[PDB]
Amino acid sequence: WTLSYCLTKWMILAAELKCFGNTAVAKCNVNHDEEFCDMLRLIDYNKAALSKFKPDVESALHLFKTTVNSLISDQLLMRNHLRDLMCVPYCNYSKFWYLEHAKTGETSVPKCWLVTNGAYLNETHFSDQIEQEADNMITEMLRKDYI
Amino acid sequence: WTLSYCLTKWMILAAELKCFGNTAVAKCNVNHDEEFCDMLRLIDYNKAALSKFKPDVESALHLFKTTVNSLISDQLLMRNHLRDLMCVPYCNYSKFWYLEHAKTGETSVPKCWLVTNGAYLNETHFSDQIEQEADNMITEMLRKDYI
Amino acid sequence: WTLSYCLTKWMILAAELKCFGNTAVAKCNVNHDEEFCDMLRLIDYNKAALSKFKPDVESALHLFKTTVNSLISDQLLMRNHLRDLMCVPYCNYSKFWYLEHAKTGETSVPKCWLVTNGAYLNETHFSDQIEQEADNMITEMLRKDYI
Amino acid sequence: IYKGVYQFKSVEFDMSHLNLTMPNACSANNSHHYISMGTSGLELTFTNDSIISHNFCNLTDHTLMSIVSSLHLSIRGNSNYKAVSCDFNNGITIQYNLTFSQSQCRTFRGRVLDMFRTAFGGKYMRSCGKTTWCSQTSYQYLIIQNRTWENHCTYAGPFGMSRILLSQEK
Amino acid sequence: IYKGVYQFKSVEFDMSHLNLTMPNACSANNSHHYISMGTSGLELTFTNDSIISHNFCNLTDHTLMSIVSSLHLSIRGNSNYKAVSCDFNNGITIQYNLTFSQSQCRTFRGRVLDMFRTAFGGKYMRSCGKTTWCSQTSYQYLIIQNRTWENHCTYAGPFGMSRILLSQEK
Amino acid sequence: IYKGVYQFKSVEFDMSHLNLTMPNACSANNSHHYISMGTSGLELTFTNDSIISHNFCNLTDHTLMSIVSSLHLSIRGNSNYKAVSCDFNNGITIQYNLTFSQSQCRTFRGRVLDMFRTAFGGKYMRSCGKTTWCSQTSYQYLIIQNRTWENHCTYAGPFGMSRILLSQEK
Numbered sequence: 041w042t043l044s045y046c047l048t049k050w051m052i053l054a055a056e057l058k059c060f061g062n063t064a065v066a067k068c069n070v071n072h073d074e075e076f077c078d079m080l081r082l083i084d085y086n087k088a089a090l091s092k093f094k095p096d097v098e099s100a101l102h103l104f105k106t107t108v109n110s111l112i113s114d115q116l117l118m119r120n121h122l123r124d125l126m127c128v129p130y131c132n133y134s135k136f137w138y139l140e141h142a143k144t145g146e147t148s149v150p151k152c153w154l155v156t157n158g159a160y161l162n163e164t165h166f167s168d169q170i171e172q173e174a175d176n177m178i179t180e181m182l183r184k185d186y187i
Numbered sequence: 188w189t190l191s192y193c194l195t196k197w198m199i200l201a202a203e204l205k206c207f208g209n210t211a212v213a214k215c216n217v218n219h220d221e222e223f224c225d226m227l228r229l230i231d232y233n234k235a236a237l238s239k240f241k242p243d244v245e246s247a248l249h250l251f252k253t254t255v256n257s258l259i260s261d262q263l264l265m266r267n268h269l270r271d272l273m274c275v276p277y278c279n280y281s282k283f284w285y286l287e288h289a290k291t292g293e294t295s296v297p298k299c300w301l302v303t304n305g306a307y308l309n310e311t312h313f314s315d316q317i318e319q320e321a322d323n324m325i326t327e328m329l330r331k332d333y334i
Numbered sequence: 335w336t337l338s339y340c341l342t343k344w345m346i347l348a349a350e351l352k353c354f355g356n357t358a359v360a361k362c363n364v365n366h367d368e369e370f371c372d373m374l375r376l377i378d379y380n381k382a383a384l385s386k387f388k389p390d391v392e393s394a395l396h397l398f399k400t401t402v403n404s405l406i407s408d409q410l411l412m413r414n415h416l417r418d419l420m421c422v423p424y425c426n427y428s429k430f431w432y433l434e435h436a437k438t439g440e441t442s443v444p445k446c447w448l449v450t451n452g453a454y455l456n457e458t459h460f461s462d463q464i465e466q467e468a469d470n471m472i473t474e475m476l477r478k479d480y481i
Numbered sequence: 482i483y484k485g486v487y488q489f490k491s492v493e494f495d496m497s498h499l500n501l502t503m504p505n506a507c508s509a510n511n512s513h514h515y516i517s518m519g520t521s522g523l524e525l526t527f528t529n530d531s532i533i534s535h536n537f538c539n540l541t542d543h544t545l546m547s548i549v550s551s552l553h554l555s556i557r558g559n560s561n562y563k564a565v566s567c568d569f570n571n572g573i574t575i576q577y578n579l580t581f582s583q584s585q586c587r588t589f590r591g592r593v594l595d596m597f598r599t600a601f602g603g604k605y606m607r608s609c610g611k612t613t614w615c616s617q618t619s620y621q622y623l624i625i626q627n628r629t630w631e632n633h634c635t636y637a638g639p640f641g642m643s644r645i646l647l648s649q650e651k
Numbered sequence: 652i653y654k655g656v657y658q659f660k661s662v663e664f665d666m667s668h669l670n671l672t673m674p675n676a677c678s679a680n681n682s683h684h685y686i687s688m689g690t691s692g693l694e695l696t697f698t699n700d701s702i703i704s705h706n707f708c709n710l711t712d713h714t715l716m717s718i719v720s721s722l723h724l725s726i727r728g729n730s731n732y733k734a735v736s737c738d739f740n741n742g743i744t745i746q747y748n749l750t751f752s753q754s755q756c757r758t759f760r761g762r763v764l765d766m767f768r769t770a771f772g773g774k775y776m777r778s779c780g781k782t783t784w785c786s787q788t789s790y791q792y793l794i795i796q797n798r799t800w801e802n803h804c805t806y807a808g809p810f811g812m813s814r815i816l817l818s819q820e821k
Numbered sequence: 822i823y824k825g826v827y828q829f830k831s832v833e834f835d836m837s838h839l840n841l842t843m844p845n846a847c848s849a850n851n852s853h854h855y856i857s858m859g860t861s862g863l864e865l866t867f868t869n870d871s872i873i874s875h876n877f878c879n880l881t882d883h884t885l886m887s888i889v890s891s892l893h894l895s896i897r898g899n900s901n902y903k904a905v906s907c908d909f910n911n912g913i914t915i916q917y918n919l920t921f922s923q924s925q926c927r928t929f930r931g932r933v934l935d936m937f938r939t940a941f942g943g944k945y946m947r948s949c950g951k952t953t954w955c956s957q958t959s960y961q962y963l964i965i966q967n968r969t970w971e972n973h974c975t976y977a978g979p980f981g982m983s984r985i986l987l988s989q990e991k
């Protein structure tokens with residue numbers, strides 16, 4: 041589905057360079073239950089547009105307005121808005137957290153790091169989600185080992 | 188995904204009180220192949236808005252119009268419309284039917300009760316769907332028992 | 335989900351008649367990661383509208399405009415557009431390819447045949463996708479045999 | 482019971498509490514229809530008598546005005562500018578004239594039935610042997626007024642209003 | 652055959668029957684383009700000669716008028732009010748003037764190519780070393796007329812019209 | 822580390838490179854807000870002083886004009902035609918008057934805060950015991966001008982502009 045795979049130095053703000061495996065990109069094929077897939081789509085569109093078209097602000101804005109639905113999940117954006125509205129921890133598209141295998145690099149789909157009152161949620165607030173994702177990922181891993 | 192889990196007395200019109208397990212709410216995380224998830228989203232939005240904001244008709248209408256896509260599945264609504272159009276049994280968002288475990292309360296995702304000619308479909312018209320859902324639910328149950 | 339199942343002679347342009355099994359139609363229940371499901375929805379809507387309503391151009395156009403989202407996947411259409419935009423092999427909704435069982439007729443979901451530079455992609459360009467689909471289909475088949 | 486283990490039962494939802502935050506769109510019977518948001522309501526009556534004869538009106542609470550503007554903009558095409566009468570004084574009262582000046586759809590009646598249709602569903606005033614697309618009606622008037630909601634129908638939900646919102650200016 | 656068990660084969664769809672209920676948008680060649688709904692059709696020709704010189708027209712069957720209004724509203728921005736000529740008498744004939752009064756996109760040509768582009772795809776009149784965004788053209792006229800469909804091209808489907816519907820007034 | 826096998830770590834995205842192709846919408850602090858597309862920028866300042874007193878303006882680069890038109894059309898309802906002042910000469914400068922002529926939402930302030938709100942999120946100027954729907958403000962002016970972007974805030978992304986695009990003319 042790539043218009044131009046894992047991230048590079050300039051896309052990551054904190055570390056020098058980190059990137060993912062094939063399972064995440066293979067799962068983000070029109071996937072709109074997750075925000076990381078939308079981020080990957082945005083980055084891919086930017087990379088493909090910069091390497092094929094000369095710089096132009098008006099034309100880029102026009103093409104974004106025409107194909108905004110093809111990149112950003114509308115309903116995820118509006119739900120995250122609604123969460124921000126009612127004093128509820130929401131996703132502001134900055135920080136994503138995931139679990140990866142120590143050796144084979146088997147990564148999962150990064151969940152968004154919720155933010156509330158202008159501050160990221162503590163690790164102990166969503167530990168249950170981390171445990172559930174670890175469990176389902178280990179079940180998927182054993183199923184893939186069996187086949 | 189809750190902005191404020193199972194139903195209560197005032198939400199159910201027929202019985203005094205009934206409600207579901209964790210699997211249904213855990214499956215209705217941006218799920219738009221089913222109408223029950225949209226109903227749950229609507230009820231959750233109403234409950235969260237009533238407990239945090241003072242009554243106001245114009246502002247509530249504005250917020251609903253802005254975030255209508257975040258709650259009601261547009262394509263499900265239009266398909267149910269198209270079904271109503273051509274003299275076909277459709278879903279009018281009133282009655283939902285499901286199967287639950289007798290002891291452990293393992294419930295499924297309630298399918299909509301189709302209506303035609305101003306009357307609900309008889310139980311014998313969609314018995315095949317009930318049998319198929321029972322089969323796939325029992326397979327999922329045995330798979331979860333295995334793990 | 336049918337408003338009126340497998341294809342017939344007049345819908346197929348190349349061969350005299352071919353059609354699919356129950357798994358594909360059962361999987362195209364509001365499925366928008368694939369273009370074949372959108373094609374099936376379009377054909378079903380046309381068949382159901384022709385057999386219940388008298389011919390009328392203006393009314394048909396009005397009903398299509400009202401329920402365009404209920405039939406054609408908007409985001410798939412815009413992604414295929416974006417692929418056409420940047421000199422990338424895209425789907426133009428003409429040719430679909432799939433794998434079926436030799437004896438029991440177990441068919442898969444037909445993937446779109448990508449087109450670039452006004453010509454279909456060669457079979458050797460997407461052989462990896464064919465192998466991956468064969469592998470996952472055989473795993474699904476063995477899982478269904480086990481149950 | 483099914484398969485001797487699981488039990489068959491149904492859910493029935495009440496839409497009365499989905500009132501202060503969500504619109505409601507229904508019909509009491511073949512004649513009367515209602516659109517209620519909170520404590521505010523609009524009555525769409527299919528009278529066969531007219532009450533207004535201005536045949537000219539200038540589009541110049543906010544909730545009922547926004548519902549009315551959504552409904553009016555959802556009649557697509559051209560409203561002929563001479564089939565609508567308005568009375569925005571001391572209440573909101575808009576009358577559609579809904580009469581012929583075998584297609585039965587290319588007229589103003591066809592499109593006004595299409596908008597009523599798409600707001601309220603096709604349970605009433607619907608046909609259905611091949612039947613024409615647009616709905617059929619035996620009246621020649623459609624009056625939308627304001628009425629203080631008193632639980633006239635059974636609450637339906639904001640689904641009809643959502644269909645109106647999607648099918649706007651197409 | 653693949654894996655010795657499953658057989659590789661393809662499907663080819665015919666869009667001729669998707670005509671009475673769905674629009675169709677295609678191009679015969681580099682010059683001519685067609686939009687056919689049922690038995691009604693619109694011919695978009697990229698002539699290099701002009702036939703109308705009014706340079707002033709008043710926007711005041713319904714199917715072709717709705718297709719034309721969708722196409723016109725899908726040119727975004729300002730149409731400069733002096734690059735369109737109209738002839739709605741005894742047929743529909745709209746001529747776009749498509750000429751300069753290295754960006755090549757900030758002009759009226761850029762946006763008119765953008766609307767043609769987004770209706771008909773990028774197989775013709777497309778570029779593609781960095782290439783400008785908007786499409787490139789060597790003609791200086793675009794005439795949209797009505798033509799009684801006679802199966803000029805191969806039927807494509809309502810996908811281009813859907814893209815027009817989505818990208819409207821943005 | 823979790824379960825003794827997998828390791829917990831986070832990703833942090835930088836939106837600085839999503840600038841030449843995508844808009845960016847942010848706030849430096851409670852006062853100032855910015856909308857930057859490429860090298861072009863718009864500064865939305867919540868001054869408590871006015872600089873323009875025309876109280877009458879005619880809506881008659883293209884990128885900033887399209888962003889401004891999206892923002893203005895996303896204030897819904899009626900703008901009262903007497904609370905906006907314009908200066909489109911030698912730059913773009915639009916001033917909203919944002920003053921009362923306990924609902925606090927039925928006024929022009931409520932809707933203008935609703936549009937600012939929906940463009941920039943609810944982190945600033947938000948309330949939150951029951952709190953009113955529309956946001957609360959202690960200023961009485963809102964000035965949108967053009968400013969040549971100089972990396973004033975941290976880049977956010979086109980999500981706010983997407984929310985503006987979805988919630989337009991509703």
Ligand SMILES: *[C@@H]1O[C@H](CO)[C@@H](O[C@@H]2O[C@H](CO)[C@@H](O)[C@H](O)[C@H]2NC(C)=O)[C@H](O)[C@H]1NC(C)=O
Binds near residue numbers: 498501632
């Ligand atoms: C409109 O909805 C509101 C809230 O959903 C209903 O008010 C409730 O009324 C019941 C019974 O009178 C009370 O027990 C609740 O405490 C009320 N809730 C709130 C939030 O005030 C109201 O009854 C509904 N109107 C109608 C006509 O059904």
Ligand SMILES: *[C@@H]1O[C@H](CO)[C@@H](O[C@@H]2O[C@H](CO)[C@@H](O)[C@H](O)[C@H]2NC(C)=O)[C@H](O)[C@H]1NC(C)=O
Binds near residue numbers: 510511513
């Ligand atoms: C449809 O229902 C409406 C009201 O729900 C009925 O109108 C009532 O008619 C009776 C007697 O005709 C009057 O006393 C009431 O005042 C009316 N109610 C309202 C709210 O106007 C109407 O008669 C019903 N239609 C049919 C065909 O039975």
Ligand SMILES: *[C@@H]1O[C@H](CO)[C@@H](O[C@@H]2O[C@H](CO)[C@@H](O)[C@H](O)[C@H]2NC(C)=O)[C@H](O)[C@H]1NC(C)=O
Binds near residue numbers: 536578581582
């Ligand atoms: C609705 O339209 C009908 C027909 O277009 C109008 O009926 C006409 O009324 C005038 C004025 O009384 C008569 O002179 C005509 O004979 C009527 N018929 C026709 C065919 O013109 C009717 O007046 C309109 N409704 C309203 C409320 O004005």
Ligand SMILES: *[C@@H]1O[C@H](CO)[C@@H](O[C@@H]2O[C@H](CO)[C@@H](O)[C@H](O)[C@H]2NC(C)=O)[C@H](O)[C@H]1NC(C)=O
Binds near residue numbers: 629
């Ligand atoms: C429609 O709205 C109008 C105006 O809001 C209502 O007219 C008011 O009715 C109340 C009811 O007691 C009177 O006290 C006011 O004097 C009326 N006029 C105003 C406010 O200008 C009218 O009642 C509404 N329609 C219905 C059927 O209730």
Ligand SMILES: *[C@@H]1O[C@H](CO)[C@@H](O[C@@H]2O[C@H](CO)[C@@H](O)[C@H](O)[C@H]2NC(C)=O)[C@H](O)[C@H]1NC(C)=O
Binds near residue numbers: 618
């Ligand atoms: C409505 O009043 C009229 C007076 O002309 C009656 O006549 C019908 O008017 C409609 C309006 O378009 C025509 O389509 C019908 O052909 C007319 N005839 C019949 C038999 O319906 C009409 O009967 C009135 N309706 C009712 C229910 O009383």
Ligand SMILES: *[C@@H]1O[C@H](CO)[C@@H](O[C@@H]2O[C@H](CO)[C@@H](O)[C@H](O)[C@H]2NC(C)=O)[C@H](O)[C@H]1NC(C)=O
Binds near residue numbers: 635
């Ligand atoms: C969905 O359809 C059912 C089936 O008709 C509706 O149930 C009817 O409701 C009406 C009033 O709304 C009653 O007079 C009937 O007696 C009911 N019929 C049955 C068989 O129970 C139901 O109201 C509809 N719901 C919505 C929201 O439209």
Ligand SMILES: *[C@@H]1O[C@H](CO)[C@@H](O[C@@H]2O[C@H](CO)[C@@H](O)[C@H](O)[C@H]2NC(C)=O)[C@H](O)[C@H]1NC(C)=O
Binds near residue numbers: 667668671802
């Ligand atoms: C337009 O589509 C219609 C229906 O999809 C086609 O009419 C069919 O024509 C075939 C062959 O002539 C007949 O066997 C069918 O019975 C017709 N179907 C109907 C519903 O009338 C028509 O041929 C199409 N037009 C073109 C030019 O291909």
Ligand SMILES: *[C@@H]1O[C@H](CO)[C@@H](O[C@@H]2O[C@H](CO)[C@@H](O)[C@H](O)[C@H]2NC(C)=O)[C@H](O)[C@H]1NC(C)=O
Binds near residue numbers: 679680681682683803
């Ligand atoms: C593109 O196709 C069109 C028609 O499909 C061609 O126009 C035809 O041109 C011939 C000779 O030039 C005329 O006799 C026909 O009457 C034309 N047909 C129509 C429908 O106008 C056109 O020449 C083709 N263009 C190219 C470059 O080959």
Ligand SMILES: *[C@@H]1O[C@H](CO)[C@@H](O[C@@H]2O[C@H](CO)[C@@H](O)[C@H](O)[C@H]2NC(C)=O)[C@H](O)[C@H]1NC(C)=O
Binds near residue numbers: 701
């Ligand atoms: C399309 O625009 C061009 C240029 O803007 C017009 O060409 C001008 O035509 C006038 C009138 O014949 C001449 O005096 C000018 O010299 C032409 N060139 C320019 C640069 O102004 C052309 O007329 C327009 N098309 C139509 C059909 O009117």
Ligand SMILES: *[C@@H]1O[C@H](CO)[C@@H](O[C@@H]2O[C@H](CO)[C@@H](O)[C@H](O)[C@H]2NC(C)=O)[C@H](O)[C@H]1NC(C)=O
Binds near residue numbers: 741743797798799
């Ligand atoms: C475009 O439409 C016009 C008007 O509908 C067509 O002009 C008619 O053509 C028919 C064909 O025989 C004549 O009988 C009529 O007298 C014409 N004029 C009318 C109805 O006012 C025109 O032919 C159409 N264009 C094409 C290329 O067919």
Ligand SMILES: *[C@@H]1O[C@H](CO)[C@@H](O[C@@H]2O[C@H](CO)[C@@H](O)[C@H](O)[C@H]2NC(C)=O)[C@H](O)[C@H]1NC(C)=O
Binds near residue numbers: 699749750751789791
């Ligand atoms: C179209 O006719 C003109 C007459 O001026 C020819 O000249 C081109 O006009 C276009 C219109 O914008 C310019 O962009 C080109 O630079 C002009 N020159 C060339 C060499 O294209 C033009 O050649 C005509 N086209 C054809 C295909 O005959």
Ligand SMILES: *[C@@H]1O[C@H](CO)[C@@H](O[C@@H]2O[C@H](CO)[C@@H](O)[C@H](O)[C@H]2NC(C)=O)[C@H](O)[C@H]1NC(C)=O
Binds near residue numbers: 427805806807
């Ligand atoms: C999808 O793309 C294919 C590949 O180009 C198209 O097939 C061509 O169709 C044209 C006319 O439409 C023929 O002249 C070519 O010979 C065809 N090429 C091949 C390789 O078969 C197909 O028509 C396109 N479909 C749509 C709906 O646009």
Ligand SMILES: *[C@@H]1O[C@H](CO)[C@@H](O[C@@H]2O[C@H](CO)[C@@H](O)[C@H](O)[C@H]2NC(C)=O)[C@H](O)[C@H]1NC(C)=O
Binds near residue numbers: 090837838841972
């Ligand atoms: C705007 O984005 C562009 C491209 O995304 C950035 O330009 C890059 O700048 C870095 C560091 O100066 C260079 O290594 C790259 O080669 C540049 N890329 C391109 C495509 O030109 C630019 O820095 C961004 N602006 C800001 C203020 O961060």
Ligand SMILES: *[C@@H]1O[C@H](CO)[C@@H](O[C@@H]2O[C@H](CO)[C@@H](O)[C@H](O)[C@H]2NC(C)=O)[C@H](O)[C@H]1NC(C)=O
Binds near residue numbers: 849850851852853973
């Ligand atoms: C919010 O930030 C803006 C700029 O990011 C601050 O405005 C600056 O104010 C200082 C001193 O007041 C001036 O020297 C600068 O020129 C201003 N910058 C701009 C871009 O106008 C503003 O003071 C900050 N607000 C608060 C409350 O701290």
Ligand SMILES: *[C@@H]1O[C@H](CO)[C@@H](O[C@@H]2O[C@H](CO)[C@@H](O)[C@H](O)[C@H]2NC(C)=O)[C@H](O)[C@H]1NC(C)=O
Binds near residue numbers: 920
């Ligand atoms: C914003 O609106 C306020 C109040 O509506 C205006 O303040 C008025 O200004 C006039 C002219 O100076 C004074 O005579 C009035 O006394 C002020 N108050 C009222 C309540 O009218 C203010 O002028 C408007 N802003 C601008 C920039 O014109």
Ligand SMILES: *[C@@H]1O[C@H](CO)[C@@H](O[C@@H]2O[C@H](CO)[C@@H](O)[C@H](O)[C@H]2NC(C)=O)[C@H](O)[C@H]1NC(C)=O
Binds near residue numbers: 911912913967968969
């Ligand atoms: C807003 O835009 C205007 C007009 O584009 C800018 O005014 C120009 O500023 C440049 C900067 O050196 C001068 O050279 C020009 O003479 C100005 N006038 C023009 C082009 O008509 C203005 O600077 C912009 N605002 C800001 C804050 O930079």
